[PDB]
Amino acid sequence: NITEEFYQSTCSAVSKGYLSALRTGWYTSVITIELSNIKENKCNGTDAKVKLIKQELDKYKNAVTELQLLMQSTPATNNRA
Amino acid sequence: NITEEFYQSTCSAVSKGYLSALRTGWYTSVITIELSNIKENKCNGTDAKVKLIKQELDKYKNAVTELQLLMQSTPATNNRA
Amino acid sequence: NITEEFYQSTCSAVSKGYLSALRTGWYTSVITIELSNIKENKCNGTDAKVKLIKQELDKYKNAVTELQLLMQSTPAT
Amino acid sequence: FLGFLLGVGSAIASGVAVSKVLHLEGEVNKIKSALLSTNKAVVSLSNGVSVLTFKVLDLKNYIDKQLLPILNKQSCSISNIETVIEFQQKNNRLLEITREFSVNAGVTTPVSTYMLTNSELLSLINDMPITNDQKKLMSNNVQIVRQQSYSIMSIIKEEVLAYVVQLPLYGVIDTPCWKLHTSPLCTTNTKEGSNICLTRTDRGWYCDNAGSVSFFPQAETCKVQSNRVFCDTMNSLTLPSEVNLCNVDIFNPKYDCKIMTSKTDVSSSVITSLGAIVSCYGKTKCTASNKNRGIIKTFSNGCDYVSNKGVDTVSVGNTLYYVNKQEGKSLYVKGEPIINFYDPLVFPSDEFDASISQVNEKINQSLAF
Amino acid sequence: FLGFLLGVGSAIASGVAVSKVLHLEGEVNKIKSALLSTNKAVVSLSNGVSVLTFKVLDLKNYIDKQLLPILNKQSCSISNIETVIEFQQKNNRLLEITREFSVNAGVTTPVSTYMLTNSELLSLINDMPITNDQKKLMSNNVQIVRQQSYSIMSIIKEEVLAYVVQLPLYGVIDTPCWKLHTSPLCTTNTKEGSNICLTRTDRGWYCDNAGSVSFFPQAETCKVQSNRVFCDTMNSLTLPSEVNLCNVDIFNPKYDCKIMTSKTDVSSSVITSLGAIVSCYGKTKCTASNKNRGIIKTFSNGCDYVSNKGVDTVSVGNTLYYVNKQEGKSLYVKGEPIINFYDPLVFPSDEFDASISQVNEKINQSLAFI
Amino acid sequence: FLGFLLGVGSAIASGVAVSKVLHLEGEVNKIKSALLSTNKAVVSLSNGVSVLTFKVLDLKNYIDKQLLPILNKQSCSISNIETVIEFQQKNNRLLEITREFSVNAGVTTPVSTYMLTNSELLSLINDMPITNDQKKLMSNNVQIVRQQSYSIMSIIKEEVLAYVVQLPLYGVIDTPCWKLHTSPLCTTNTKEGSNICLTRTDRGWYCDNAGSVSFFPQAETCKVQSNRVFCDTMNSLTLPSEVNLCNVDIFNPKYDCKIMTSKTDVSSSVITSLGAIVSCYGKTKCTASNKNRGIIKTFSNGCDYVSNKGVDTVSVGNTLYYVNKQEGKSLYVKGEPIINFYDPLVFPSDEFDASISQVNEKINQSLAFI
């Protein structure tokens, strides 16, 4: 049930009938992904399927490397004064 | 070693102990990707593997088409006056 | 043919020779994607090809569920 | 307009606190031990905070079993293409999460479906120490919850990737809210530079809150779902409830209504919830139209208004405005423009951030001189 | 600077109106029936609005026919990995659309290629009821069209997913546009606090439009492609054409030119289309350089200008500016700085949003009192 | 607050300049010739500029050799499924790069890993002709480098896709920086509209730089990593070092400290590095609390401050502020609020952008009239 009033005297209008949902607090949850440690596989293979797995595993290792840098960094800090 | 002073007389505070890292200039480098020229291949092979290759090849040609449009344009500039 | 004039008296400059392309209105079009009704999927056989398909169909079913909520809400920017 | 008056806080201070605890010696083991049996557990951290923990992906089990023994060779060959495809499926979510974090310096908002899927988000909401009415609220507005949430990269240590998801809690619900729309009010005399102007600067969202009123000067920060208004109290000023008196009686003694003055009688329109305010001055063409007939009203100089009933568009100069088509009744409250009450000879015509009484005292001082 | 003078509009009010009509029962059936034979049709809705409809993906046909009967079991087993791969290809677009909508509360801008591919977008433009000059313009600037478009999630009802795409229409094309750059103009007296300042506040994009001039105070909102300027009229004021007189004669009687006054003589530069304005005050080092040669010009205190011909960079204090390298001729119009015409003793030195005549009347009142 | 005083520059003017050179005929051959043997070379362009060149993907070699002869048909047939998957892997980066460019009108920021991987980025940094200390800085802060970088689509001609990546170079490193936080200072009367106010407007980041001070009025634009402050000089004013005197003595003769005046006695808090500034006026409830201990400080009307030691939160009205948990010492410098030095009857109570001396001269004029 939304209504509105216009005030000619001050060139303004008020829209009423709304209900609030103001954030007052925070809930912090921890999301986890279980990873595995892999370094220098003793394999060449030189077949099509292992080659696909290896380069996909390279994406994995590079992702882990990048995430390790962000662990060392401090988040955000772009605040007004 | 971060310290802070509050000045009651002027309602202000100074936080010291920080070190600078100011962007003063720009370095421009050119990144290249080597592509190949391919057009309407008149092949009539029609099994599952070729259809997948064909439609993946269509994505490639569509990417080149879109990139060609961006080459002919002058890149997005959004400045104050 | 772009030219520019600087006015020393008022510390200002005008760049002319540009051509307009102003948005004055809106055109609304309806884009549709034809979907199919699947209600989970009951099936046995525990091999790789169906397992990939099962979980891909799970992505499909999860997408419609989310879209159904967005249908019930009112959009705004 | 009054956005510079807001205070300064850090939105993710809570998530950062939990993240730093995860960097503590031995902290990962508590989470790892509690998730060895299930995928969803409630761990108490060393700083005395109770957090819901969620294991959303187990790449370790897959890699160690369906990949690691085959690559711990010697001569390796892969057992069919589905093993490679399924790995790409499993690995993709990790790559996408890393990708978002790497361009957002480890902090993302809104929280993507990669960080937390629609199914996972609904599961979290169900296990939170909140009212069943709060669960239903967040569940029916997950898209809003997402936009007001943060994802903070924390640790990747001892075969565990952990990041903090910071969800909003709405402690103020179902209190009346109202939106104030304002537009310039100028005199309408024919000489070009002979007009004075006045504009209420207190436009924005207002919500009743804890005996006072929460005022959101940047109304753009609030999110509206039907008749529900989602706002963040960090982006608000706390005002006495007497601020509402400015709407009915702008010269009331209880509250000093904020205004700005000028001599710029420029034309514009403000689209409201159920209509449109039109400030038409000078030689500007101002009209209101319907979809079928076209122009049905031509505005004269001054500040006027039309409801959305039977009106689809409003044109001011070369600008076309579409009105909101929401259902509701509008009331036109007649009254003489307060700008007429002022003497243009002593009217302070450049008050950028002032008020009614402040303008009055300046008039008194100029009059005494 | 004068963005606070702008009106307030609802950007997707038109698209939302169409979306709400789609929620009506049986409205979905009309579109589906008109799209059972073809992929592009014009459907009329129940409130008498006619919209172009476009079917971009048929997952129903794929799933039900080439995939589902193997699952119409009993004991199900799927042959061909290519079937799994092709399904992942088709399903991906749906997942990406859902992904974008779920993180944008059902409204996205710009419109992604998942929402509407480059091929599909070009097809739409071709069927719009507008002049062909609008068609070729939109087709050659599809990346701009995308940035100015909205996608609004509407309905998913048995058994069609429909969303509204709101495309821009350019009703004003090929009219002359010009960009006004302004910078602070101050006196050059030696003491750090003895100076008065003046700045034109009417900077931004200007375009001739319907006998008047559309003025865009926040030039950042406009997108420039070579010599073509894409702007949104919602971000504009409609002004008399006499506003252009402020450029040649700021004291003209026909238009009250807008200025701001201060005593803040800080140094800066404004990079223009074909050069750079330099406001150099106090002890600031202000220079213009060429890449190989180095410094080729040193600015004195006051407001000056250099063209981009032979100039690569401009430095004001510790800030380095790169100039635009576009070709074109610059004209330096000499004239005495108007700030010299004022008496610093009666100069209103804190008018944040004023004008020439308003400053004058303040001077007269202060002068009469003394 | 004083962001409106900033100059105007063109952020990608340098990259665009290089891009336009690449559009010139024969320019591509030079790049192509230098990259036939290696993937990273320094090519000279036709206008005498030297740029690092980088080949990150060779789709030509893959398509022409391991794909094209199978399509040199006639009857085209694919023997293995691995061929389809491998092609999708190679082709993906190109599709993602095209996707980002197509929704950003050919200019993206920050630079994604699709545009430039972490390995490629680190390789560039190591080969930029820069100080050896700049290399370690950029390498340890690649996420910041990415956010401050641009990727500009240039050309796709003669089987070559080329785009310009514009990376930041930090010419000012390890100079002391400090952040100034300011909040409204008002008289402490409880009844509305009875108060006069004053606020320092020079809040923001400050860094020592080349004998002067770089001032960043909008501190939100700077990125802070621990005690390292990453800022862009384009978002700064260059000020004399005497501006720092405003912190110790706001009435000092050497520098005219910037302030604004008003009658808006609204309540708020500013979270600093090691505490919180609280401006509490009217009937607003203002407190500081510990999570376990509870309320440990209640603010009176006026401007006050609390350190983060033993403090977890600060509450002003209906707004909860979390204090920074960083370790460090705070010094409370006592002194009478300067707003008390003014006569409310001649106090100019609406100066949006003024200063100490400007307020003083305005008081003198009002005082002389009486």
UniProtKB/Swiss-Prot annotation, chain D:
Residues 22-73, 345-369 form a coiled coil. Residues 1-21 are annotated as: Fusion peptide. Changing C246S: No effect on F1 and F2 structure and glycosylation. Changing C257S: Impairs translation or folding of the F protein. Changing C222S: Impairs translation or folding of the F protein. The N-terminus is a hydrophobic fusion peptide that inserts into the target host membrane. It is buried in the center of the trimer cavity before cleavage by host furin. The coiled coil (heptad repeat) regions are probably involved in homotrimerization, heterodimerization and in the formation of a fusion-active hairpin structure. Homotrimer. Heterodimer with fusion protein F2; disulfide-linked. Interacts with host NCL; this interaction plays a role in viral entry into the host cell. As a heterodimer with F2, interacts with host heparan sulfate. As a heterodimer with F2, interacts with host IGF1R; this interaction activates PRKCZ/PKCzeta that recruits NCL/nucleolin from the host nucleus to the plasma membrane. Part of a complex composed of F1, F2 and G glycoproteins. As a heterodimer with F2, interacts with host RHOA; this interaction facilitates virus-induced syncytium formation. This is Fusion glycoprotein F1. The gene is F. The chain holds residues 137 to 505 of 574 of the full protein.
